[PDB]
């Protein structure tokens, strides 16, 4: 049987990180097969250096790994696939370091054989912290790249449409993002966070646009927004992401669309609006009511007195005086431990990866 380790000569360490990190292509057929392969290879290399009791070699590899991943993302950090790939692999590397740490708290899902593969000489808890902090940075980068890709699509897809962007453009792009993350073996709980963040951005940009234009507050637009949100919700359902928290991030937009469709005349109508619009600030509620356009001659505009009644009712809210959502808010990310069933002693390195100078142990 193999031990589940990989040996390399110290003089080949730079060649190792060159071929495994700096020049590794995330779209290669050989790394689709085992999502996380770079992380598993690195860990198996750490295992052997640990087995040799070689603290200097373990440090050099671990330091070189962080430096190389940072280098790749400085050079190709605007490519979503590259950022996703290295986020996924940084996380898998972190999970490996925990799963095979020898700490009982991380071994509950291990097979007996996997428990045989724990590190024996070095406690890498401090490195795990460094790696976690890197993953946070990569995640922030990923959010920024996805945001930049979606931004040109959002107002036309969500508000204007009843090269060129529609709701279907947004859905196609979300499908592409999600497929890529899945192909990379990104943790399901991390994909959920990414999707929550993307939905937040969609909702914030949409609502802010609605509040800044003069032509988006009508009953008909409310209907359109409702429909578009319903399609985003169906996308979540199809991807089994309805517990991601993503739908809940759209509450301000959802409430604005509802506000467009309710009656806006009586004291009872005002009470109802105050009861229903918990996710909108007073300024947002008042803005929408001031912008509202009647559907035809049988509907009227909202009166000044009605608007003042809303203000009076909401007077004791700890309300932010702000009008616009902060579309650059990023929810704090977490990387909950996700052990894998992959047996290290069975992992083969594809010959096409150019790592023939590494040896299986």
């Amino acid at each position: 049987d193999f031990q589940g380790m990989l040996e390399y000569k110290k003089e080949d360490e730079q060649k190792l990180v060159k071929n495994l990190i700096l020049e590794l292509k995330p779209r290669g057929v050989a790394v689709n097969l085992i999502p996380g392969l770079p992380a598993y290879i690195l860990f198996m290399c750490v295992r052997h250096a640990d087995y040799l009791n070689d603290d200097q070699k373990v440090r050099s590899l671990l330091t070189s790994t962080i430096n190389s991943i940072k280098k790749v993302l400085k050079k190709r950090g605007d490519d979503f696939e590259t950022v996703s790939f290295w986020l996924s692999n940084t996380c898998r590397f972190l999970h490996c370091l925990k799963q095979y740490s020898g700490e009982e708290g991380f071994m509950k899902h291990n097979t007996s054989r996997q428990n045989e593969h724990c590190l024996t000489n070095f406690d890498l808890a401090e490195y795990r912290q460094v790696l976690s902090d890197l993953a946070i940075q990569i995640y922030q980068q990923l959010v920024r790249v996805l945001e930049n890709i979606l931004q040109p699509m959002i107002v036309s897809g969500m508000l204007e449409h009843e090269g060129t962007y529609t709701l279907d453009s947004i859905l196609r792009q979300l499908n592409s993002f999600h497929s890529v993350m899945c192909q990379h073996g990104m943790d399901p709980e991390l994909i959920k966070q990414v999707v929550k963040q993307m939905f937040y951005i969609i909702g914030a940009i949409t609502l802010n646009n609605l509040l800044l234009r003069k032509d988006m507050c009508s009953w008909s637009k409310g209907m359109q927004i409702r429909y578009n949100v319903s399609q985003l919700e169906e996308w979540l359902r199809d991807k089994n992401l309805m517990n991601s928290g993503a739908k809940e991030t759209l509450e301000p937009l959802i409430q604005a669309a509802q506000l467009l469709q309710v009656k806006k005349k009586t004291d009872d109508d005002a009470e109802a609006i105050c009861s229903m619009c918990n996710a909108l600030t007073t300024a947002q509620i008042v803005k929408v009511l001031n912008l509202y356009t009647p559907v035809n001659e049988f509907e009227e505009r909202v009166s000044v007195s009605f608007i003042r009644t809303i203000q009076m009712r909401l007077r004791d809210r700890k309300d932010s005086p702000q009008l616009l959502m902060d579309a650059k808010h990023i929810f704090p990310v977490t990387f909950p431990f996700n052990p894998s069933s992959l047996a290290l002693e069975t992992i083969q390195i594809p010959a096409s990866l150019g790592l023939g100078f590494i040896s299986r142990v």
């Binding site: 603290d55 373990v58 330091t63 962080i66 430096n67 000489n121 406690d123 890498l124 401090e126």
Partner: peptide, 12 residues
């Protein structure tokens, strides 16, 4: 017992 391998900025 395993030995804690130290990580600080200067290592990187």
């Amino acid at each position: 017992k395993k030995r804690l391998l130290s990580f600080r900025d200067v290592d990187f």
